[PDB]
Amino acid sequence: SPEDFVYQFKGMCYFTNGTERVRLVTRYIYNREEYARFDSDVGVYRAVTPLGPPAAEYWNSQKEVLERTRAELDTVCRHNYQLELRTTLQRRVEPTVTISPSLLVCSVTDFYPAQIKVRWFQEETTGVVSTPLIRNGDWTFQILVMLEMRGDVYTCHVEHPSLQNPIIVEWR
Amino acid sequence: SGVTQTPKHLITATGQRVTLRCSPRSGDLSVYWYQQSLDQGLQFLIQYYNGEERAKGNILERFSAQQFPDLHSELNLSSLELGDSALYFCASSAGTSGEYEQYFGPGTRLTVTEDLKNVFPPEVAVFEPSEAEISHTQKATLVCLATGFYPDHVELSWWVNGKEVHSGVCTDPQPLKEQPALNDSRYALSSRLRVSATFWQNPRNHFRCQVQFYGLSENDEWTQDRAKPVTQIVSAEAWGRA
Amino acid sequence: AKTTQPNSMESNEEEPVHLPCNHSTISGTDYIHWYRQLPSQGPEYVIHGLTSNVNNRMASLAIAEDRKSSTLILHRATLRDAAVYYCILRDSRAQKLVFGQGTRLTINPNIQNPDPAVYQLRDSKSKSVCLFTDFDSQTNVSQSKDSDVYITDKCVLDMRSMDFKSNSAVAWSNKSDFACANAFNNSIIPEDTFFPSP
Amino acid sequence: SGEGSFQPSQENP
Amino acid sequence: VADHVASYGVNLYQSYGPSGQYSHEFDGDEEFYVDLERKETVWQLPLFRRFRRFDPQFALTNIAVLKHNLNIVIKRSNSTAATNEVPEVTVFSKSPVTLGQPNTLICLVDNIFPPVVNITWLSNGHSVTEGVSETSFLSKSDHSFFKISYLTFLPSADEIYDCKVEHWGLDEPLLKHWEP
Ligand SMILES: *[C@@H]1O[C@H](CO[C@@H]2O[C@@H](C)[C@@H](O)[C@@H](O)[C@@H]2O)[C@@H](O[C@@H]2O[C@H](CO)[C@@H](O[C@H]3O[C@H](CO)[C@@H](O[C@H]4O[C@H](CO)[C@@H](O)[C@H](O)[C@@H]4O)[C@H](O)[C@@H]3O)[C@H](O)[C@H]2NC(C)=O)[C@H](O[C@@H]2O[C@@H](C)[C@@H](O)[C@@H](O)[C@@H]2O)[C@H]1NC(C)=O
Ligand SMILES: *[C@@H]1O[C@H](CO)[C@@H](O)[C@H](O)[C@H]1NC(C)=O
Numbered sequence: 001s002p003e004d005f006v007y008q009f010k011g012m013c014y015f016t017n018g019t020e021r022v023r024l025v026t027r028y029i030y031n032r033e034e035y036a037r038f039d040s041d042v043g044v045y046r047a048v049t050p051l052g053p054p055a056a057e058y059w060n061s062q063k064e065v066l067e068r069t070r071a072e073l074d075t076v077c078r079h080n081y082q083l084e085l086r087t088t089l090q091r092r093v094e095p096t097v098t099i100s101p102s103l104l105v106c107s108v109t110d111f112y113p114a115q116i117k118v119r120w121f122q123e124e125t126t127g128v129v130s131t132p133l134i135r136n137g138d139w140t141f142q143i144l145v146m147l148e149m150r151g152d153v154y155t156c157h158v159e160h161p162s163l164q165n166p167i168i169v170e171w172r
Numbered sequence: 173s174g175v176t177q178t179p180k181h182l183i184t185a186t187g188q189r190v191t192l193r194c195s196p197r198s199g200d201l202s203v204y205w206y207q208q209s210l211d212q213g214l215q216f217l218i219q220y221y222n223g224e225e226r227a228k229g230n231i232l233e234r235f236s237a238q239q240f241p242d243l244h245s246e247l248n249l250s251s252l253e254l255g256d257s258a259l260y261f262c263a264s265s266a267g268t269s270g271e272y273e274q275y276f277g278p279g280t281r282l283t284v285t286e287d288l289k290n291v292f293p294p295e296v297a298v299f300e301p302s303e304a305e306i307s308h309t310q311k312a313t314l315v316c317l318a319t320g321f322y323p324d325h326v327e328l329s330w331w332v333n334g335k336e337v338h339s340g341v342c343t344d345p346q347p348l349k350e351q352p353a354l355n356d357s358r359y360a361l362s363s364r365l366r367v368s369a370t371f372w373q374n375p376r377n378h379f380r381c382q383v384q385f386y387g388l389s390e391n392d393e394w395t396q397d398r399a400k401p402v403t404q405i406v407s408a409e410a411w412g413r414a
Numbered sequence: 415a416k417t418t419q420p421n422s423m424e425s426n427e428e429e430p431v432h433l434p435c436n437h438s439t440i441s442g443t444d445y446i447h448w449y450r451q452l453p454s455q456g457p458e459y460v461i462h463g464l465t466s467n468v469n470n471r472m473a474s475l476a477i478a479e480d481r482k483s484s485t486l487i488l489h490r491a492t493l494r495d496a497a498v499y500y501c502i503l504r505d506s507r508a509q510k511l512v513f514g515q516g517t518r519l520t521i522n523p524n525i526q527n528p529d530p531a532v533y534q535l536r537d538s539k540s541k542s543v544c545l546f547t548d549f550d551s552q553t554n555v556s557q558s559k560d561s562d563v564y565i566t567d568k569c570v571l572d573m574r575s576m577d578f579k580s581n582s583a584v585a586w587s588n589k590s591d592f593a594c595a596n597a598f599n600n601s602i603i604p605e606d607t608f609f610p611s612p
Numbered sequence: 613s614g615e616g617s618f619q620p621s622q623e624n625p
Numbered sequence: 626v627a628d629h630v631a632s633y634g635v636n637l638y639q640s641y642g643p644s645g646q647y648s649h650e651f652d653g654d655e656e657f658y659v660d661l662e663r664k665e666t667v668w669q670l671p672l673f674r675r676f677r678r679f680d681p682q683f684a685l686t687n688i689a690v691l692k693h694n695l696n697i698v699i700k701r702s703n704s705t706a707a708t709n710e711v712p713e714v715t716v717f718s719k720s721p722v723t724l725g726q727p728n729t730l731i732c733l734v735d736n737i738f739p740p741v742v743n744i745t746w747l748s749n750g751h752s753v754t755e756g757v758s759e760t761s762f763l764s765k766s767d768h769s770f771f772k773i774s775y776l777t778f779l780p781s782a783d784e785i786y787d788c789k790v791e792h793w794g795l796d797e798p799l800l801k802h803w804e805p
Contacts, residue, residue, distance in 0.1 A: 001709060001793045002641060002793065003640070003641075003706050004639055004640055004641040004706060004707045004739045004741070005639065005640040005695060005699050005704075005705075005706060005707065006637075006638075006639045006640075006707045006738075006739050006740065007637075007638045007639070007691050007694055007695035007698065008635070008636065008637055008638075008768060009618075009620040009636035009687070009690075009691055009694075010632055010634075010635055010636070010764060010768075011617065011618020011619075011632065011633055011634060011636075012630065012631065012632050012633075013630070013631040013632075013633060014627040014629075014630055015627055015628055015629040015630075015631070016627045016628045016629075017628065018628075021627075023627070024618075026618055026621075027768075028620070028621075028694070029768050030695075030698045030702060030705075031705065031706075031707045031708070032707070032708070032738060032767075032768045032769065033768070034768060035698070045621075051698065051701060051702055054623075054624060054701065055621075055623055055624070055698075058623075058624040059621045062266075064271040064272060064273070065269070065271060065621050065622075067271065068269065068270065068271035068506065068619065069621070071464050071506070072618055072619075074442070074464065074465075075442065075443050075464065075506050075616050076616040076617060076618050076633050077616075077631075077633075078442075079442040079443060079616040080615060080616050080631065080633055082442075082613075083613060083615060083676075083677060084629070084631070084651065086676065087672055087673060087676050087677060088651055088652075088656075089629075091672065096720060098721055100721055107720070107721040109719065109720045109721070110719070110720065113652075114652070134717070135653060135654070136719055136731060136773075137654065137655075137731070137733075137760050137763075137773035138669075138719075138775075139654050139669070139670055140719075142719070142720075173456065173458070175456075199625070201622070201625065201693070202509065204509070206457075206511075213513055213514075213515070214451075214457065214500075214511075214513035215513075216510045216511060216512070219509055219510065221686075221689055222689065222692075222693055224689060226509070226682075226685075226686055226689065227508075227509060227510045227682070229510065261456050261457065263456075263457075265509065266622065267622040267690065268509055268686050268689065268690065269507075269619050269620075269621065269622060269690070270445065270504065270505060270506045270507045270508055270509065270619065271462075271506070272509070273459040273462070274457075274459060274509070274511065275459075276456030276457045276458065277456055278455070278456055279456050297537055297538070297539065297541075298537075298538045299535035299536065299537055299538070299542075299543040300535060300536055300537075300538055301535065302533035302534055302535055302545070302610070304533055304534075304610035305531070305533045305545075305547075308529070308531060308608060308610070309529060309531075309548065311573075311580075313533075313535075313545060313547060313582070315535055315543050315545060315584055317541075317543065317584075317586065339572065339573060339574045339575060340571055340572070340573040340574075341571060342569040342570060342571035342572075342582060343569065344566050344567065344569060345453050345454070345567070345569075346454075348564060348566065350564070352561075360564060362566050362584040362586075364545075364569065364571055364582050364584070366571055366573060366580065366582075368576070408538065408539070409538070410538040441613070441614065442613075442616065443614065443616045506619075507617065507619055507683045507686065508682075508683075613678075614678050614679065614680060615633070615649070615677060615678065615679040615680075616633060617633050617634060617649070617679070617683050617684075617687070618633055618634070619687065619690070620636060620687055620690045620691055620694060621690075622690055622693060622694070623693060623694040623697035623698065624697070625693070625697060
């Protein structure tokens, strides 16, 4: 096996309740261990491994470095959220819903955002096996729900923010 | 500031190649080059960080730079044109991160000429204080005059009793043109030294105006009958008068 | 130009100066940098900021609420603070400094007891020099219209040991028609200017 | 309106 | 714990090559990456390409700092090499598979460390290159990576597919099969 030395720097933003709560966490990682970090709630660089003190102490002693990182809540986090509000947060992709026998599985594919509610109803039934929410990686999600199960018609109800009214798909 | 630059002055002919050296502050990883011309002002040329190029300005193909392992930098200006006559400033910062301020060197003053036969050392003269000034103010102003020099690469200093002085001294911000209409015109520069009348009236006091001229070097060619206008000190002195 | 500043600013020594700057096209990632350049010196960093009031050992920086303008505050500018002040927009992640025209700040010395006069000085060895001195900051020295007559701009010296400052301009010529009485004729010199009899 | 990004702090050399 | 999590961004630099990666993530998905050799920003959505802009110089400046930082910490940690992890491979379809209708096969390659992997597709044992796309090394909370490879195809009873994954953590190249 070849020798490898990996370095990672992750500048992460955490948003809660629109623009009300904003928090940033910068992570400096050697191989897989995060030796030093900066949490906006703490306000100063903190060593999180005995490999971190020479880095954390040096960055905190430099006022220009400390102030730039503190300001990164505005120059990065708050700045980019406004760019997300006009793009990503307005992305609404209607799901494709098709019922196929396998047991009748309700295939809910290619939707964004993650917020989805799928229920089988005839009245609503209890005793359904639903797979976890699958990330396709192409900015779309998929979820499959199976039920135990003459003349009666089975309806799959799907709720998503992209639709004003739910998509009703029957199986006679 | 901490940043050093060599040479301080340069006098070159059109078409020649020249190399400018710079040493950043001890610990500084990022190095920068700027050009200060009369026509374009302060212009960014290039940035180096840990030996590699990070940012480029409106730098010509004739211009090229490098950051060496000891983090020192060199700026090479080839096929020199009269328009290349400018101040070349070096700068350095702790790193490339945008919060880091830049520390600038003293700069290299480059004058590009069509012929190095245009280079002339100055003539220095000391004008003794006015008896009417001494009578009216009880102060004595000595005036120094450096004339007929090209390029305007001069450092004027006053020396009293073998000691360089700064108090009561004031020199023109820049040399003026003796022939403003003419290209490669020789320059003139003046300076004042003001002392008390009693100090000037002591005949044991010695006053010397020193003009350091930056001209041709041992690497510059010379084929003319007149003395080679080399980097030299031209002085004028005067004694206290009772 | 990304920033707009007044071309020139005049102020008295040991007095505060408020240097204004407009930058309406600023972005949320841009910093406001202030640099300066003293005569015959390399540029020097003053201060930088993002929002509101920023302070350091050298100056204060007041950035407007909309961030479209800012002010550099030099709390007590001295004769040594006479320089060109550049207001520069730079991205918080960039290093390249884009210098505009800037503001040329002139600091006026305090001439406690003005005594304007034009004196004649004789050479130590063997031209002749005329010295215009002890005039106040109100007096401005004009350039010569005569090609063979050379007149310098005003310059201020400080005799530290006597707590005394004075202004001075020098005029010289090779012409026989040149005399100290007519040397500064193109200049608006004071009425009370003393002209000694040679 | 250009994207904002975090800057890694330089290790002491 | 938040409503939205973003990485602006994931900065990666390793000694093997040497090689690096710059990307921005939002709610677990890749917005864009910067092609370090082309010095170009590549957005992962048409909406992003039309509305959003990122200067690649900032990505390249960041990798230059990471290179400096890595060489300092290598000397500090007495030259501690990366531990090779065993990756987890999951193969599935994007939409319900129907004979004749075009579909896409997703190959989730989770727990990648070091971020050096060869993800290829094999149709009936023979290699395929046409209609193959891949994501960048997407970050995880445990500072490991995951990559997702795609294969656009036409489902039939004649074609069988395999996702071939080569990694240092594996002794033999791993192969996850799929059948319509
Ligand atoms: C979610 O955020 C909103 C903020 O508004 C928006 O939220 C979403 C929808 C996005 O659009 C964002 O971009 C927006 O920001 C919260 O609502 C806000 O709640 C605060 C509660 O503090 C309230 O603040 C004022 O309350 C007091 C005056 O009315 C005042 O309290 C005291 O303050 C000092 C001490 O610091 C004291 O000395 C004084 O004497 C004073 O009594 C306080 O300082 C604030 O002025 C906001 O008015 C309110 N704004 C709006 C538009 O609603 C929301 O909070 C929740 O909802 C409100 C209505 C309250 O019920 C509150 O108690 C709830 O927490 C956030 N929700 C959650 C779940 O966090
Ligand atoms: C990828 O394939 C090449 C083929 O030459 C090989 O050299 C390299 O080591 C492979 N990478 C891994 C991680 O197996």
